[PDB]
Amino acid sequence: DVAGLTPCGESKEFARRLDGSVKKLQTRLSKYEAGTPPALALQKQIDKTKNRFDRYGKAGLLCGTDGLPHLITDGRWTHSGEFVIPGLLFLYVAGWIGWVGRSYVLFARTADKPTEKEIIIDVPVALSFVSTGFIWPFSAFKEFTSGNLIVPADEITVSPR
Amino acid sequence: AKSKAVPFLSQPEALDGSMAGDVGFDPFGISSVIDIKWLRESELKHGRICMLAATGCLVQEVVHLPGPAFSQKMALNAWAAAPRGGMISILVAIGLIEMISNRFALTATDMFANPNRVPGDLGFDPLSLGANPANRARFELSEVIHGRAAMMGFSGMVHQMIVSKQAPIEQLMHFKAVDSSLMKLGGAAGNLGY
Amino acid sequence: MDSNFLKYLSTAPVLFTVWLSFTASFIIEANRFFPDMLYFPM
Amino acid sequence: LWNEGKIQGKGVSVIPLFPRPASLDGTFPGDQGFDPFGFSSWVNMKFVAEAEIKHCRLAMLAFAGIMVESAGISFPGATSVLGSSKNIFEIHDKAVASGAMGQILLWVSFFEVVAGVPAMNEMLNGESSRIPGYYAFDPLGQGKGDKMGRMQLSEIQNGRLAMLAVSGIVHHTLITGKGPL
Amino acid sequence: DTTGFSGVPSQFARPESGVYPAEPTEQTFLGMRGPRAPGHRENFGGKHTATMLAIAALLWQPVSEAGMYRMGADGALTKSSFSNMEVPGFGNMKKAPTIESLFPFAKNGFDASPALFGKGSMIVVEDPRDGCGAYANSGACHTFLDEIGDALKK
Amino acid sequence: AMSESVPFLKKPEALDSSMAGYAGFDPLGLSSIADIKFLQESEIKHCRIAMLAAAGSIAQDIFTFPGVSKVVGTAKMTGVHDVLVKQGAMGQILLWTSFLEVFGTIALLETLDGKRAPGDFKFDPLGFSKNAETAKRYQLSEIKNGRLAMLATGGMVHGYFITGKGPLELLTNF
Numbered sequence: 001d002v003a004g005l006t007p008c009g010e011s012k013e014f015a016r017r018l019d020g021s022v023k024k025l026q027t028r029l030s031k032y033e034a035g036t037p038p039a040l041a042l043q044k045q046i047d048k049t050k051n052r053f054d055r056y057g058k059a060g061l062l063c064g065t066d067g068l069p070h071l072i073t074d075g076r077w078t079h080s081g082e083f084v085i086p087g088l089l090f091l092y093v094a095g096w097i098g099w100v101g102r103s104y105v106l107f108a109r110t111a112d113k114p115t116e117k118e119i120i121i122d123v124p125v126a127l128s129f130v131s132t133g134f135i136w137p138f139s140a141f142k143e144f145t146s147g148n149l150i151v152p153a154d155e156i157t158v159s160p161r
Numbered sequence: 162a163k164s165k166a167v168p169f170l171s172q173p174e175a176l177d178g179s180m181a182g183d184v185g186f187d188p189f190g191i192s193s194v195i196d197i198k199w200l201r202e203s204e205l206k207h208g209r210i211c212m213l214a215a216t217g218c219l220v221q222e223v224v225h226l227p228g229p230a231f232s233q234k235m236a237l238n239a240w241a242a243a244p245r246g247g248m249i250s251i252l253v254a255i256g257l258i259e260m261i262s263n264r265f266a267l268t269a270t271d272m273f274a275n276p277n278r279v280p281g282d283l284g285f286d287p288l289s290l291g292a293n294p295a296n297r298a299r300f301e302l303s304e305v306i307h308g309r310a311a312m313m314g315f316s317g318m319v320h321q322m323i324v325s326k327q328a329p330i331e332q333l334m335h336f337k338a339v340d341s342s343l344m345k346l347g348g349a350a351g352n353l354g355y
Numbered sequence: 356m357d358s359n360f361l362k363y364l365s366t367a368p369v370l371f372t373v374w375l376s377f378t379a380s381f382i383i384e385a386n387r388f389f390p391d392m393l394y395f396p397m
Numbered sequence: 398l399w400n401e402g403k404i405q406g407k408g409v410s411v412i413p414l415f416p417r418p419a420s421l422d423g424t425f426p427g428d429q430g431f432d433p434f435g436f437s438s439w440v441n442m443k444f445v446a447e448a449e450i451k452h453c454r455l456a457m458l459a460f461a462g463i464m465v466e467s468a469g470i471s472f473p474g475a476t477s478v479l480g481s482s483k484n485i486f487e488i489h490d491k492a493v494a495s496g497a498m499g500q501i502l503l504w505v506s507f508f509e510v511v512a513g514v515p516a517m518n519e520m521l522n523g524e525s526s527r528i529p530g531y532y533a534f535d536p537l538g539q540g541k542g543d544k545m546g547r548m549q550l551s552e553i554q555n556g557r558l559a560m561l562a563v564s565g566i567v568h569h570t571l572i573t574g575k576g577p578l
Numbered sequence: 579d580t581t582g583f584s585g586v587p588s589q590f591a592r593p594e595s596g597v598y599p600a601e602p603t604e605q606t607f608l609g610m611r612g613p614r615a616p617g618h619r620e621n622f623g624g625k626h627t628a629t630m631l632a633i634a635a636l637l638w639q640p641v642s643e644a645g646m647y648r649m650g651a652d653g654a655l656t657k658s659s660f661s662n663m664e665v666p667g668f669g670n671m672k673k674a675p676t677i678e679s680l681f682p683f684a685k686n687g688f689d690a691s692p693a694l695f696g697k698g699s700m701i702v703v704e705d706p707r708d709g710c711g712a713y714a715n716s717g718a719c720h721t722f723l724d725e726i727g728d729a730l731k732k
Numbered sequence: 733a734m735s736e737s738v739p740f741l742k743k744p745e746a747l748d749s750s751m752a753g754y755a756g757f758d759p760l761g762l763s764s765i766a767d768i769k770f771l772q773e774s775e776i777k778h779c780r781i782a783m784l785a786a787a788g789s790i791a792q793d794i795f796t797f798p799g800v801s802k803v804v805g806t807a808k809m810t811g812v813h814d815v816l817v818k819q820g821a822m823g824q825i826l827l828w829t830s831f832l833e834v835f836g837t838i839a840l841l842e843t844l845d846g847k848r849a850p851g852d853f854k855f856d857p858l859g860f861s862k863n864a865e866t867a868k869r870y871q872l873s874e875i876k877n878g879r880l881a882m883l884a885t886g887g888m889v890h891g892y893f894i895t896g897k898g899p900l901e902l903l904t905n906f
């Protein structure tokens with residue numbers, strides 16, 4: 001397929017991975033009686049292992065010669081669920097955490113004792129900030145263009161050189 | 162100075178009997194931590210959503226739009242059956258409604274920035290039904306009460322759909338009791354997993 | 356509830372321990388009900 | 398009449414075992430002590446009075462209905478479509494299945510929502526000064542002095558007796574399998 | 579201090595606009611209450627909004643029935659798509675976009691009506707009572723009230 | 733001030749005898765909920781449509797226009813609706829009444845502005861409301877007959893939903 005890779009649903013090495021993983025569990029299950037708790041624990045692990053291999057095969061992942069799934073991350077849309085969408089999901093959470101943390105440090109500067117607000121957090125106000133993070137892309141860009149994100153270079157302490 | 166709802170507790174501050182549906186019920190003291198304006202905005206919103214949702218379940222049992230994608234009497238099955246494109250259309254339209262009706266004052270730090278903004282009052286009166294100021298207090302009371310009742314009712318209906326794989330009216334008309342041989346609560350750690 | 360005890364629970368180490376235990380806990384729960392998510396399913 | 402002080406008034410006790418409470422006012426037609434659990438302290442007196450008169454009126458009408466339908470007395474052709482039994486329970490179940498009970502339910506509930514609920518709301522709000530249980534339903538005269546006097550007390554006592562007797566009749570029919578008359 | 583979720587941007591050290599318009603009271607039928615321009619509710623008010631909906635609902639009736647209605651040998655009418663109208667002078671484009679491209683009911687199998695729901699694709703109204711009563715049922719119908727009666731007699 | 737129609741209830745505080753067909757009957761307080769001019773325009777609209785509907789039920793049972801028995805066979809009352817939707821009869825009726833209802837919408841919005849009496853489309857081609865006393869009497873007659881025809885229409889169509897007979901045929905049989 002892409003980069004000489006094979007879809008995991010027709011990879012023979014993927015098929016042997018699934019079989020070897022189950023033979024390894026079945027020989028541990030061969031040492032226990034049917035209704036025992038170790039037998040049910042291993043029978044649930046054989047169900048989980050088979051389910052995972054079935055899902056990967058039908059997902060559009062590509063396997064290598066080694067029979068393991070490989071991720072395509074060049075930007076193509078047929079493979080966006082491996083990096084681009086998990087990445088879009090990450091950056092939304094990361095910017096949320098950043099926007100919310102930034103909003104609280106600016107609040108704490110206007111406090112009676114600014115450093116006491118950072119070791120003893122005003123939890124009702126800090127929870128007010130965490131809820132605000134859901135629209136951080138719009139809130140932060142408007143913050144930028146309204147001249148409130150970036151401070152000018154001449155209000156920042158620098159080393160003499 | 163005791164609560165009227167809970168007679169053995171002290172009456173909570175930020176609850177002064179002005180708001181509709183105010184009977185002194187805040188035993189956990191959330192009103193002392195969270196501004197009552199935000200709490201009433203969220204209560205009216207949750208209640209309005211649940212009025213539509215409870216009505217949605219019952220009417221969806223009775224009446225359907227045409228087509229096989231809309232033929233699910235059980236409302237929890239309708240979630241999966243309904244066309245995904247149109248369901249995400251509903252979601253996107255809700256988001257557009259949320260930003261515009263709130264006028265870009267969406268968050269915990271900028272909703273109610275305008276002193277004119279009132280909790281739950283979005284300017285929505287298309288037919289001017291609240292034009293009469295004599296009906297205002299009882300409309301506010303019965304909106305809050307309908308919202309609370311529908312929150313409880315929809316919660317019950319959803320979890321009765323989970324327990325009994327039946328739609329709400331025909332669960333009442335073809336009732337089957339809980340055997341307890343299925344859907345036992347908890348237990349993920351009692352058997353140590355699996 | 357005592358305000359000095361609530362001011363103690365608002366201290367940075369308690370909130371850090373509680374929040375990251377809560378955060379760790381819904382990752383653990385999400386991987387119980389929805390395991391082996393190597394990809395966003397699409 | 399009123400007989401204020403003698404019967405139905407302040408200083409009147411049906412059972413002086415229980416002292417007459419202060420919260421129970423002496424101006425409500427039918428007040429003859431009997432407030433043990435102290436409900437008059439916190440309930441709306443106007444609401445509970447209207448509820449009492451309505452429970453009284455149903456009890457009387459239901460008693461009349463039970464007597465007629467246990468004596469075998471009927472309207473022409475009613476026993477033809479409905480059952481021939483005199484068991485009040487059996488008639489109710491088959492008149493439900495006939496739709497007659499549905500029609501009475503429909504029309505009672507219509508009156509009770511379009512007229513009963515506004516009447517209750519105004520009587521408790523303070524917009525109309527309607528005495529409890531009043532619906533201006535006096536077609537055949539017999540009002541005037543009596544209307545606010547003995548008839549209010551006669552109605553309330555016949556209604557309380559009708560409530561107790563109707564409960565008695567239905568439970569006797571339950572424990573025996575045979576109705577009265 | 580700041581209570582938490584107060585909503586005022588000056589209590590969270592957030593930059594506010596400083597501009598907070600006074601809230602008027604006038605409303606429009608399919609729009610919302612709020613600050614408008616002067617004269618806006620006079621031209622785009624309830625009168626405008628109701629009238630525009632009325633025209634849109636009237637013009638829906640030709641659109642919901644859009645098609646090429648042609649008579650055969652007798653007076654019988656055949657319905658066809660407007661795509662069958664081949665425009666003569668547009669090079670390689672011979673089948674043209676029409677009003678059926680902005681309102682493609684047929685492709686989704688809708689069968690629109692001037693009342694929005696046609697004989698095919700009609701509203702489905704079922705009865706959830708399933709042809710039995712609230713109490714004292716017999717057969718494949720056991721109501722909740724029957725379950726209360728079953729428990730009390732056991 | 734108590735209601736003339738419901739004596740134990742109060743006067744409905746938005747209704748006055750200067751209205752046509754007033755009896756003080758608003759027990760549910762809807763005249764306080766909705767704007768009263770809208771309610772008045774709606775009642776007269778419902779009244780006139782139901783008057784046509786009841787008279788049409790009666791007349792359709794009496795006679796039927798030439799050629800109609802071909803297309804409309806055993807169908808009667810609501811039954812003819814689906815067969816004539818296939819034909820363009822109901823489509824044409826809907827088209828022209830909707831066309832009139834755009835102007836009805838403009839009229840109602842002027843009524844809510846307060847420049848028009850409810851239901852007043854100024855339609856008096858033949859002369860009946862020249863005199864003021866006659867005008868008021870006919871206003872009351874129109875409202876009362878329209879109210880009666882609303883209930884009539886209800887009964888007639890539900891009688892079809894029960895027996896399938898039609899008004900005149902339900903009188904003749906059973």
Ligand code: CLA
Nearest residue numbers: 097098099100101102103104105121122125126127129130
């Ligand atoms: C939410 C608060 C916050 C925000 C907005 C930023 C913002 C930034 N930091 Mg980070 N930083 C923070 C907290 C924060 N910092 C803390 C707590 C530490 C101590 C570990 C650091 C240590 C740190 C280093 C060493 C570096 C940065 C860098 C940067 C820059 C690039 C982003 C990055 O590399 O992230 C990296 C983030 C980290 C390495 C640690 C973040 C740890 C957590 C997730 C954030 C704190 C959450 C906080 C408790 C919020 C609570 C809010 C609540 C009270 C409402 C950017 C200026 C880099 C830079 O200058 O590049 C230009 C860089 O080299 N920061």
Ligand code: CLA
Nearest residue numbers: 226243244245246247248250251252254683686687688694
């Ligand atoms: C940008 C405008 C736009 C466009 C072009 C479309 C286009 C489409 N929609 Mg979508 N839709 C939109 C906005 C839009 N939608 C919005 C804003 C919502 C959210 C309210 C929806 C919700 C939605 C759902 C739920 C469904 C569609 C479906 C469809 C498709 C088939 C349509 C069809 O056969 O119609 C011809 C059929 C009709 C016109 C019948 C209409 C039925 C009535 C009018 C519904 C009652 C409306 C109800 C009262 C909603 C009130 C709330 C609202 C005012 C906020 C088509 C691709 C369907 C789909 O995905 O099919 C695969 C589907 O099931 N849409």
Ligand code: CLA
Nearest residue numbers: 454457461464530531532533534535539548549551552555
């Ligand atoms: C013994 C019963 C009794 C008594 C004393 C009263 C007395 C009163 N009622 Mg009440 N009422 C009753 C029963 C009674 N009612 C019942 C059962 C109903 C439901 C139908 C009503 C419904 C009612 C309304 C809706 C209203 C009143 C009102 C009034 C007042 C004025 C009317 C009046 O004086 O005429 C009463 C005249 C008589 C009681 C004469 C006797 C007629 C008898 C009881 C008929 C018997 C029927 C039949 C033969 C049953 C016996 C046979 C059966 C066993 C088989 C007065 C306080 C009005 C008021 O102002 O309330 C405050 C009002 O608005 N009543």
Ligand code: CLA
Nearest residue numbers: 781784785787788791792795796797800804812813816821
């Ligand atoms: C709510 C009103 C209403 C509705 C929906 C219908 C609908 C229908 N009628 Mg009925 N009809 C009506 C009123 C109504 N009619 C009235 C008022 C009469 C006369 C008393 C009739 C007499 C009638 C007959 C005899 C027949 C129908 C038939 C039909 C069907 C075919 C349409 C047709 O050609 O009718 C034709 C009907 C007419 C030409 C009468 C129209 C009456 C108009 C509205 C009077 C308006 C005059 C008034 C002064 C206003 C002037 C307008 C001005 C403001 C510009 C259709 C289902 C036919 C059918 O299929 O029956 C089985 C049929 O043969 N109608």
Ligand SMILES: CCCCCCCCCCCCCCCC(=O)OC[C@H](COP(=O)(O)OC[C@@H](O)CO)OC(=O)CCCCCCCCCCCCCCC
Nearest residue numbers: 316345346347348349350351352353354355377380381384
């Ligand atoms: C305002 C809204 C009010 C919501 C009310 C909630 C109603 C439903 C609550 C449970 C109903 C009855 C439970 C019996 C069921 C029961 O007790 O089962 C027991 C179960 C543990 O299993 P065991 O050790 O009992 O196994 C026992 C053996 O018999 C079987 O193996 O307890 C749990 O931990 C399950 C709940 C999850 C605990 C964490 C929940 C998520 C945490 C989120 C943050 C805190 C939220 C509140 C946590 C309490």
Ligand code: KC2
Nearest residue numbers: 606607608609610614618619622623626627628630631634
């Ligand atoms: C001639 C082109 C034209 C057409 C074909 C057309 C059709 C419809 C329909 C048809 C189905 C409806 C239902 C409708 C309703 C509304 N129109 Mg209207 N409309 C047209 C022109 C304008 C302009 C220029 C404005 C405007 C507005 C509004 C507002 C909001 C008022 C409010 O929120 O206060 C509402 C509810 C104003 C605005 O604010 O739009 C955001 C505004 O300036 N319209 N409009």
Ligand SMILES: CC1=C(C#C/C(C)=C/C=C/C(C)=C/C=C/C=C(C)/C=C/C=C(\C)C#CC2=C(C)C[C@@H](O)CC2(C)C)C(C)(C)C[C@H](O)C1
Nearest residue numbers: 206209210213226227228229251255258259686687688699
């Ligand atoms: C914002 C927010 C709130 C909220 C909220 C909520 C929960 C709002 C939810 C709203 C919903 C559920 C809206 C649903 C709209 C459905 C539509 C338009 C269906 C269209 C069908 C079509 C086009 C078709 C078709 C056809 C097809 C394809 C083929 C045929 O075989 C079948 C068929 C003929 C039918 C509230 C107001 C509560 C409060 C607060 O302010 C915050």
Ligand SMILES: CC1=C(C#C/C(C)=C/C=C/C(C)=C/C=C/C=C(C)/C=C/C=C(\C)C#CC2=C(C)C[C@@H](O)CC2(C)C)C(C)(C)C[C@H](O)C1
Nearest residue numbers: 212213215216286287288289290307310311314317318329
């Ligand atoms: C405001 C506004 C207007 C408007 C509007 C609208 C859309 C108004 C609609 C309001 C609605 C939909 C109110 C619905 C309330 C529902 C309740 C209280 C249900 C509670 C259920 C319970 C208690 C239960 C239960 C159950 C349980 C769990 C067990 C089950 O087995 C069964 C059972 C069902 C019995 C308009 C647009 C006209 C314009 C105007 O200018 C302004």
